[PDB]
Symmetry: D2
Subunit: 126 residues, 4 copies
């Protein structure tokens, strides 16, 4: 990614923010991938809630990553509110993915990414 490079060249120009942006896109892609993999499983009926939570997590992580890419200045912003929402979403998604992690390696990877994004988003709210 180019998050760090672009922040430094912004005319209104932060490690916690760079890490949060990176993780939001990483998590958005991973959740999209996890939902699609759950949809291909023989036992797809067992994974309905996990697919649904992945879909919401991918939507909220993209939104958060976009908002946070525009949060390099000092002006009022929705950033902290959005990051709290992303954190809560990632917490929910992680718990459900974690529950299937013994059965589906893709859900283990997704749960780990959601946990990391949750942590990153919380850290950026400081």
């Amino acid at each position: 990614m180019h998050v760090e490079a672009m922040i430094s060249k912004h005319p209104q120009a932060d490690r916690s923010l760079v890490q949060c942006v990176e993780m939001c896109f990483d998590c958005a892609q991973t959740c999209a991938a996890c939902a699609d993999a759950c949809l291909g499983e023989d036992k797809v009926a067992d994974l309905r809630h996990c697919i649904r939570l992945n879909l919401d997590c991918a939507e909220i992580c993209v939104a958060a990553g976009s908002i946070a890419s525009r949060a390099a200045g000092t002006e009022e912003s929705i950033l902290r509110t959005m990051l709290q929402t992303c954190a809560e979403m990632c917490r929910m998604c992680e718990e459900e993915c974690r529950r299937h992690a013994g059965n589906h390696e893709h859900c283990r990877i997704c749960a780990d990414v959601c946990k990391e994004c949750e942590t990153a988003c919380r850290s950026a709210t400081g």
Copy 2:
């Protein structure tokens, strides 16, 4: 829109929810349009914060409308948290658009739509 029609045919099948979904997409489109119109104004330098807030509002309204389109059942969901975030975003965007409404009719229309979406999102959290 087909929000009402699709909710009723959902196998896990609410006026406040239908109104919120409709308004989130209406507001997403209106904010996207408002940012683009502000970008075309002679006095674009005066509208920087308004463009930025429109961009964040369009992102959050789409996300909210998507999440709420999947919230027709009884299972745990990020819905209330997301709708509070949308409400707060629309409040911010409305205030800035409102400030330019005497000068730019497109900002008057956008402020009115943001106010309505804010109200709809708050009502759906009940």
Copy 3:
């Protein structure tokens, strides 16, 4: 929606474009709803491809509607290319939803909306 009202107040200021924008958001919401309803069906395993195509259609319709909301001027734009892609996507999604329409009323509604969006997007490329 406020598409027509916002186009007329744009400083660079078209019926086919207003109809396309409206339909793209209508279709994005309807496909999101259809995927979520398919995920709740007893026979979810039979609907894997339909869910997947709905997810791609909702993503592409939002993108198209956003791009087209910014296409009110005369400058070079990705608009025609994006609308052709939306048309092709809606065609694919319609065919799969249509196949399940006798079994699931939500897929009948979605197929009808996808057909209309396809038509609208093609008309706006003129």
Copy 4:
């Protein structure tokens, strides 16, 4: 990112695809960042078209990256069409960012990322 790891664990389980997905998210974030930086410049009026093209590029790159994250199987997909559209979008955005690269380092970085994403998307269509 976790693109490579998730592809390998997909029940329907490609270097060109992993590179395209990674680049689409990298480019989406970079274009979002570039538009926000152009909005903060003293000479924002000179950057209107660049901001607009960045906004469309961020929208199309996210959509492409999402679609391509679900393209790990053999079934019919919009993937090739979407990747051609992303390529064309990145080409347009690159040319405009490149034009400002002598004046704004953020536009130099964005033009380089758009060029790479364009190349990656074209390579994945093979």
